[model samples]
Each structure stands twice: as C-alpha cells, then as structure tokens.
Target chain A: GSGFRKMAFPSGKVEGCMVQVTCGTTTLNGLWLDDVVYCPRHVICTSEDMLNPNYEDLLIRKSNHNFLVQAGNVQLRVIGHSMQNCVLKLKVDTANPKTPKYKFVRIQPGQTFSVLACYNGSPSGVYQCAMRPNFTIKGSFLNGSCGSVGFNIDYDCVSFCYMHHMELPTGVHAGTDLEGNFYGPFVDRQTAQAAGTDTTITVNVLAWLYAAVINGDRWFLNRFTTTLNDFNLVAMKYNYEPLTQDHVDILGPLSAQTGIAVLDMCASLKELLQNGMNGRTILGSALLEDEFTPFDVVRQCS
Target chain B: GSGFRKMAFPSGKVEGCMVQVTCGTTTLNGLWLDDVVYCPRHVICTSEDMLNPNYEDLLIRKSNHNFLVQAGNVQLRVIGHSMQNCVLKLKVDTANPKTPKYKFVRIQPGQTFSVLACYNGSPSGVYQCAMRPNFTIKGSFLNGSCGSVGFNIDYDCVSFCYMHHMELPTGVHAGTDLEGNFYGPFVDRQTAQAAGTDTTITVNVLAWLYAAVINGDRWFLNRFTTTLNDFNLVAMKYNYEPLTQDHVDILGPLSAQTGIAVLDMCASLKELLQNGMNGRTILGSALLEDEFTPFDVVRQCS
Candidate 1:
C-alpha cells in the first residue's frame, strides 16, 4: 500500500487496463473514473500493441524490400522494391515542394539500415545497417512538429520473417503505422539466396594487437602491467578475437568509414616518462562497444 | 663465395658431399686423405641409413598394428596384432628372469603421446601418432639394463586407423622411427566423417565482462585503459571467440589442466591506489603467442 501509485486510461485502453501512469500520493476515483488527465508522455504497451505516433496514414504502402520512415513532417520511403538497389524519396507534407532530398540506398541480408534525415538542421539523409535480422525497431518519433525527427524500419528477409512470424505484410502502409511493421513480398529460396550475397562482415581492428610495455620508471611499468592483465582477462571472457594485420587489410574500407579512433597511449606515456613527470598519469581510453581505458607501451621492435 | 667455409666427409659418405663444416679458410689435400679421424657424433646419411642400436630384432615385422622400440641394450616390442588390447613384451639379452615393467597408453586421432624412457638420468621417450587407432599401452619403460620392460596395449577400432594411414604395425620392431612420422592413409569423405566424431571444441570464458573504470587515481587509471585497448585489438585479430560462462563450465577440466593464469590488475591497482606508495609498478603481461611484455603502471598504486 505504501508504494502504490495512481494510473489512468486517460489515453488508450490496453485490454481494459490503463496504459499510462502518474506518480503521486493522490487517491483516484475508483468507481466513476472519467476526469483523470493521464500523463501524455509515457505509453506503456505490451509487445502486441506497439503504440503509434499522432500522424495521418500515408495511404502509400511499401512493396517487398522497401520501407517508409518519417523525419519531422517529411515522409521518406524507398522508390522500388528491388534488392539490387533503390532510391529513398522524401515527401515533406509542409515543405514548399523543393527538389526531393533523396539518395541511393542498399540493404544487406538480415540487416536493418537506420536512415537519419532530420538531425543537425540538415535535410540530407544518413543510413547504417545493423548486419542482423529479427531486430525490433524502437524510438520512432518526430520532435516539435517543426524540426526534423528520427524514425526506424524493420528489414526482414521475407521467408525468414514468414517462417518465424506468420503473415508478414506484403506492402508497407503509409503514415501512423507502428515503426516496426514489417512487410515485403513473399521471397522464394533463390531470391533470398541472392540477397545473402550482399552481406559483408567487418571485424574489430585492434582486437589482438600487442606491444611490450617498456620504461625505466618501475612505478609506471607496474601499474601498466596490472591494468593490462585485468583487461586481457575481461577481454577473453567477452569473446574478442585477436586482431591481425590481414584482418585490418581485409576490412580497411569499413575501418576508415567507421573512423574509429586508435589511441596511441604508449607514445603518450613514453613522452611523459622521458619528461620526468611524476604524478597520476592520464592514459587514454579505447573504443570498443564503449570506451575502455588504455595505457602506453614501448614502440614495436619487430 | 668469399664467406664460405670448409667441409669434410670424414665420417659417413653422403654421395661425396661433405658432412662436416669448419668456419674459415682451409684447403684439404686432394690426393691424400687418410689421416682424418671419423667423427661418430656426426652422421651425414641420406634417408636410407636409419641406423639401429645394439638390440636383437624380434624379426617380428608389424603386420600393421604394432611397433617396437629399443632402449639401451634391451630390445622391447609389442607382441601380437590385436586392435582390442594386448601386452608389450620385452626380452633382455641378459636378464635374471625378473618381472617386466609395462603400462597402458591411449592415442587420439592426431596426437603424439610421448613414451618416456631413460635419457640422461631423466625420463624421455619421445613418440608420436597420426591420430588414428585408439591405442592404450601400459607398463612404459625404464633406463639401464636389468629388468625386462613390459607394456600393456589397447589397439582400438582398426577401421578408423586404416582410413588414414597405409598400415599400422601389429607388433613392435627394432630400429629408429621419427617421433612424429606424420603420414596419411588418405582422407576421403567417409574417413573424415568418421574422424569428425572424435574431436571436441573448447571455447574461452569471460569475454563480455567489463565495467567502467571508476574510483581511480588518474595515473593508475590511464595505464589500465591503455593496456586494455591494445589487448582487445590483438585478441580480435587472433580469432578469439568471446569467453562465455557456459563454455568454461563445459571445458572446466581442460582449462584447469591448461591452467592459463588469469591477470587481475584492477584489484592490484586499487590496492596500491588506496595505499600511498611510490615505487615500481608492475604492468603485467598478456599471453599472446609473442605479445607479452609486462611493465609497471606508475610506481606503486598499492
């Protein structure tokens, strides 16, 4: 009773249950509940009822291998359903019909490519693939009803989607459809096989590189050793493969495209050691899924 | 040509090629060559002259499932050609009718289990296998020349071995065999299919475990971040799968038998940081094939 809070259907009814909540000690009118203003911000729905935003249906649906995303008031959708390639056409309901800001886009097999349109006050679109299927789309929304917003699309191989979840949409619906509504034409084995060829794997470049930690300063050296040992143990548990020269060469384009930073802590520490600095050293961090701390080591003698 | 050295065949004939070498300039008398003492230490024989030591041959050429190994003046050989299991009987040219010392041994598909005997006051009997024929031989061996060396044997599933190599010997013989004379009986699909059932894969543990570096003195912290970053990169290149708890549990015996040391620098560094110390910090090394150069972080953190 002490931790109970008030909730109301103020918005949508989820199987006779309120889909909204408000945190307060105020008691609610249990029997004749009609005037409670449910907080509009939060909409807690089950997996079955994915909430949709306040926008009119586009009436235009997507074909197989195509999707629609909304940024700001502009409705962006792919022109064709061909797996080879297609153009992303943007339709802003409010714009004065300027030249369409569109670009050629490709989807990898089992990948959901995120297309960003309304960020940084720019109309240009940006897209990235997750390299996986069965991914659910979340965080589909528009900001201020004026500035650009971000949206998501579910990219599924038709057959794969069909076998797992019955009745995949054959066409993409326009407007207000929940972000994750997946649709594509029924794909045969041959077509699905062809789409699989487009996929490429990019591995982490620095997963296995190593160098000796060398310095005359014993104190500096000891701390580095301690940190490295722990880091390695943690890394091994995480299923990281060791990076080699060949792997980097194979994934060079992706490496540069992603522009992940390479931290040369060894150089930084070497300079500090030589300069006779004595204090808490600030070794840089590495970028994996997240930033990890890094220490310096000697130059490669090999 | 100018840096070439002098060579002589004063020990064994190698198709007239010199078998011994001496650095510097030395001219041999072309016509007169009888004063040089033959060096028994160096034998430059071609593949033909695999010399045998002083041991009576059992004249028991292995039909294809047995082998004979000689130790000192004693001649040891496995009698009979059974794949199920048998005994290795040893006969000394001169023993006072004592019990034979034999043991059981097993073989994997492509593993060389060393059979250690007497060598320079220590056990050292080297042996290898092509990874076929389940072999279990007991009553290994001993040095010197007194007791008859006895050995038990278990030759399993001859069809498995027959698929890979020409023919495995049935009984031991007298002479020199390379510790690992790897040869293929030839691997067809059927053979490979049968062999596949013998191999097991063990994965690493704890690759996906990491938390933000917190409660740190800057100097100690920097070094750890640096070390972890490089370690992760190298690991990726080496094709190390992230370690998972399940893998370790399944392969617990193997991992413990391998006993790869787990390095925990964070705990060590935290201790040092809490304790005000200024000295050589040991940056522990990682266990890459050739990538372990440990060092100190910054004097003392503990």
Candidate 2:
C-alpha cells in the first residue's frame, strides 16, 4: 500500500504561505504534509502527474525543503499505539523552521504527550512532529476536523505572553516606600524588637512606620496602629501635626485597660495647651492629675 | 727661631695616657703639647726629658701629631684680641683630639666665644678648643654651686602607671560612665535634643549615658547630674534602684527654682514608698503627675 502522499517543493522557492494536501475525504494543511514524510516506506504514488509542481509528486524524498503551516485554535495530543518507538515534538515560529526553539520531549508508545499551545485563541504558527509506524495525532478540535478532512487554512495577527517589571525584594531595607510604591513586606517589627540588646529597634521601627504612613498604605498603617500606637501618638505630636480624636480613640483602650489615664488625657491636653490656649484657662489644679490637664501644667509651670 | 718641638711616635705606638709639657710656671696636658706645632718661633724649651711617655717631650719638629685635652668642670671664654683670625672650638672627649665630634665655631678676633659645661656637678668630661695666636682657654671655676644638693638615687624596682582599659567609643553610642574612675565626655543632651530631625539621637544618647553610668566616669556623671538632675531623679525612680536625701538635695534647687515642687518631693516620696512602704503608700490620685512620680506611676499602672 502507498503509505502517505507527500508535497514536494521542486523549484526550491520557499515563501511564507499555507499549503494543503488531500486523500479521500481526509484533508491536511501544510503541517500534516510535513508529517507525512515520517512514513519511511511511503515512496511515491506512481500514478501522480509530474506536470504540476503544486500537486503531490513523490520524487526521491527531498528532505531539506520540507515546511509546514498551522493556524487557528490548534491543539496536538499525540497517543502512541506502538510500544517499541517514540515521537519528536518540534515548534517553529517566524524564525527558521529547520530548527526548533525548544528541546523535543520523547513520547513512548502507549503514553500520551500533552501540552499547552502558546496561542490558544486563533493561533498561527508551525508545529511539526514525527511518529512511529502507526502512531496517530489524537485530540479534540473546534473546527471539527480530524483525519477525515484532508486540509484546512486560515491566518490572523499572533502574539505570545511575555514578562516585564517583575520584582522580589530580598532584604530588610530593600522594600520600596509609599512615594516610591515598593510593593513588599512591611518592616518586621517583631524581629526588630526581638533583637534584645538592639535598642535601635525602636528607632528602626519608627522609621519603618513613618515610611508606611507616608505611603498611605492602610494595611501597614493598621498594623502599626495595632502595635505601636503609643509611640505613634508621641511621634505625631512632635513630628507631625496635632493629634486627632482618632489618635485619642486608639490610645483610649490602652489607657483604660492599663488605668494610666495619662495616655487619654496627655494627647488632648497637649493639643489644647500647645494650640488653643496659652495656658490661660484657670482650673482647680488640686482635683486633676497634672497630666490630665495640660493647660494647668503649662499655667502652673509658667 | 725654630718651630714648636713636636712629639714623634716613630713606631706609631698609641696609648691612652696624659702628657704634660711645661714652660716656666705654665703646664699643659698631652693635648696642648700636641698643639705646640702652632708656635712657630716659641718652638723648643731646651730643658726637655724623654724618660717617660706620660711626661713632656721636645723631640725634633714633626708637624703632625696634633691633639688637645680639656677636663675638670671646664669652661672656655676667650676674648679674641685680633680682628683678622677665627678660633677653632674643638670638643675632645679623649686625648687623640685630631677629630672633633662637632665642627668648630669660628670666633672673630675681638669677640669672645663663651660656653658652659653640661652639668653643674663635679662632672669629668673633656672639652678642648684652640685660637690662632695666644687664645688662652680662660674661665673661672667655683666649688660652691647653686643650692645644697640632696642625694637620692635608688630605683626601687619601680612602676606606678598601669594599662587600665581605656576605650573611646566612636560609633553613635559610646560613652564613659561613673563609678570609681572612668573619664570621658558626657553625652551632651543639648546636642542630642538639637539633633532635631534625627530621631535616633535620643536612643543614641541614652545608650551613651548608659555606657557612661556603667563605666563610672565621675566627672561625666557629675556633669550629667548637674544638668539633667531633674530627669535624673525620674530615671533613678523608674530605671535605677531608688534615691537618697543626697539625691534630693542635689535636685533641690532645680525644682524650687523651676517651681516644679513635684520634682523635689517626688524623688523623696518615691524613695520612701519603694523602699520603706513597698507600694503600700497611697496618695491622692490628683496629687501626682504620672511622669513626675515613678513609684506612684508604677503602682497605679500595676
């Protein structure tokens, strides 16, 4: 039996175009024609016409001039029926088709080699593979063609996924800050604090929190408020603007739980003393803790 | 009218000995007899003997074997009488004298070249010099030196200084503290506070102060005590053990002057509470400021 009919480029003129070859009801694109050469015994269909260069004419196998064209939602899942042999997987793009872009994976008989295509949506490229004696390419297709249709052809603009701007901050200080928007971990306060003799931990943590607040990252701010809200209050009082009710509220629970009413009162009293009044308010200093009424402290001290 | 008679070492046999040559009442050592070659016409004192190598000799004029010897608490002050010549200031420690350790100082004829010997004691070293004509080595000597001497020269296998551990901390935090003796500069609180936007200053100064305290530099501690005595009171209450009336007295004027009576009273009260009553003392909550009194703060917070 004539194993498979092949397409020949006798003129040696190669252009980037699609070709199709057919047998009874089984039509294949240029890709399948490229695969037919794998059947070593398929020499020539002697009844073929020699006058037409476009038609299949088996001339003593011209190996170097082989090519393929594939287009649209192409999938290849090869299943081997022969246990003694394997197949080669080749991928070709706009570059030279004679060379594969990646190393070929050998698929033994009875085992299937499955993979994802670079372009799953209307892809056009070259995928040429070889098979053993009776191995076949078996997979689902959207255009509803298998071995039944001899060939099909189509094309569209193509693209492949690429990577850009991927970063991984690997050190403690490597993290980017808000104005810079370095998306990485917050400064590890627990580790900083755990650095027992490292008294610089407080300052380092303060710097980290300062960066996070200025960056306006709510998550980092929330973490900071949860851990160092007391230091945060003092830091704000000295470095930033006056403390707000939000600051009072955050420090409130700590004050109440610890019964150090100073925390709740100090921030508010300092605000009043520093901004609102020049220690003019006169009150019964005997009734309040000195810290609870700051204008009084200012007045008394003044 | 022959030149000065010279001693001849016909066989070149040299010896370390004194030679005295005499003319009338003037006597010279082995050194001047060597310099007799300078007198061209006053060459020979015909009353000469050659029995001893240590005595004066007047052999035939040999012109070469020149020498000069000077000893005793010697001083040479020559008033040059001629204007045309210069003096040769030779310093010869031993009698061979041809080679001087230092180049000669040339004195003009009418000028006096005067110098003193190194020691005022009975020092025994040679200092020889010569002038062109009759440059007499003329200077007076005295037995009664400046003050009554005290003789004390015995090394008692002695050493007083030792290698105590001295360290100058150069990083952000290094300071000497107080105890018996470390000496260094105090962590200037003004500098620390003035470090304005530099937030780490407080911790750095604290570390420095802490090191100073541990090292026990009394002067630095005294300076720190004098300036930060108020804060020192609070620091003592919370961080250190407690305080005494001594501490109170030291902090006395500061509190009274600043009208922060709380400072003076808090230290003593905290000491009383922490030491005698052991947290049993209760005071009006309004009567205390959280920052001013450490014991009450500790008790109330606890």
Q: How many residue pairs clash in each candidate?
A: 122, 18
B-chain TM-score, candidate 1: 0.22
Model 1 CA lDDT for position A204: 22
Residue B135, model 1: Cα distance from true site in angstroms: 74
lDDT of 2 by residue, B1-302 (tens): 00000001010011111232223332332211122211111112223321222111232231222322233334222221111111112233333453212211223111211111112222111111111112221111112111101010112111111001111121111111111111123221113211111111111122222222222221222211223355455545443323344544543333443333434334443343245432221222222112112211111111
Best by TM-score: 1
Task: At residue A136, give the lDDT of candidate 1.
Answer: 19
Quick one: best lDDT, which candidate?
2
Give the least accurate 10-residue stretch of model 1 chain B, judged by summed lDDT: B291-300
Q: Is the docking of candidate 2 incorrect, acceptable, medium or high quality?
A: incorrect
- TM-score for chain B of all predictions: 0.22, 0.16
List DockQ, one per candidate, in order. 0.00, 0.01
